[PDB]
Each structure stands twice: as structure tokens, then as C-alpha cells.
Amino acid sequence: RACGLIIFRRCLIPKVDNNAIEFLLLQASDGIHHWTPPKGHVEPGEDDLETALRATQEEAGIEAGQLTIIEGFKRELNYVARNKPKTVIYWLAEVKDYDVEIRLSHEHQAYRWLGLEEACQLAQFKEMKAALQEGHQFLCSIEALEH
Numbered sequence: 548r549a550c551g552l553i554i555f556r557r558c559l560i561p562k563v564d565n566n567a568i569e570f571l572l573l574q575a576s577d578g579i580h581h582w583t584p585p586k587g588h589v590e591p592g593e594d595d596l597e598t599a600l601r602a603t604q605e606e607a608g609i610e611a612g613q614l615t616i617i618e619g620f621k622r623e624l625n626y627v628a629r630n631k632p633k634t635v636i637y638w639l640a641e642v643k644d645y646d647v648e649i650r651l652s653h654e655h656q657a658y659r660w661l662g663l664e665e666a667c668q669l670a671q672f673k674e675m676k677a678a679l680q681e682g683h684q685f686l687c688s689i690e691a692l693e694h
Contacts, residue, residue, distance in 0.1 A: 551586025
């Protein structure tokens with residue numbers, strides 16, 4: 548069981564920014580080099596949201612002071628990969644600074660910041676695509692309520 552954060556940043560130059568929201572995906576070092584948001588396995592007695600925060604620091608180098616958890620969104624993914632069951636729980640979090648330094652561990656070899664459509668295409672896997680679409684939809688609905 549793993550927990551992570553769908554990490555996004557806002558792109559606020561309307562004359563040129565194609566996507567007002569970009570999502571962070573990390574490419575795995577091993578296997579077929581999947582692309583996912585930051586995530587990591589739970590620890591005995593650790594709260595699932597604290598696992599997501601810790602795994603984000605470990606996999607992406609993003610520290611808690613650099614993030615803001617967006618309340619109201621959570622998405623649990625259950626799927627089979629390589630004949631093995633996987634559960635991942637994601638919350639949603641915004642980086643404070645567009646230019647936040649991404650530092651990978653040995654587990655990942657690259658990262659991209661992408662608009663929703665391209666994030667979906669790179670993520671490829673249907674439940675991850677759904678989770679990102681749903682995250683984006685949630686962010687738009689909040690912005691409308693605040694607007």
C-alpha cells in the first residue's frame with residue numbers, strides 16, 4: 548500500500564501559458580519506466596497523508612514548506628500490475644514556487660511538468676488518467692466557488 552501526492556503548479560501568464568495547471572510526473576528507473584506522481588509505501592503507525600508528504604520529499608525532493616495540501620480531494624487507486632495487486636492513495640498538492648527544485652532519488656530517472664491532456668497521455672494507465680482528470684476537475688470547481 549502506497550500513498551502520494553498529485554503535485555501541480557499554476558501557470559499564470561495568460562497570454563502564453565497553454566495550461567493554467569501543470570502536473571508533475573516522475574519516470575521510474577526500472578521496469579518499463581512508468582510515469583506517475585510521487586508516491587511511497589506506508590510505515591507502521593504512520594498516517595496515510597504523512598506517508599504522502601514523506602514520499603513526496605523522498606521521491607521528488609519537495610519539502611513540506613514548499614507544498615500546500617488542497618483539502619477536499621482524495622483518490623484511491625486499486626489495480627493489478629505484473630500479476631500483483633496495488634493500492635495507491637493520492638491527495639492533491641500545489642507547489643509554492645513554479646521553479647521548485649525537483650531532486651530525484653535512484654528510483655526515478657526523469658520528471659516532466661505537463662498540462663492535463665499530455666499528463667494523461669504520458670501517465671497512459673487508465674486509473675491514473677482518471678485520477679488526474681478528476682483532480683483537475685476538482686481544482687476548477689474550487690476556483691469557481693471561490694470566484
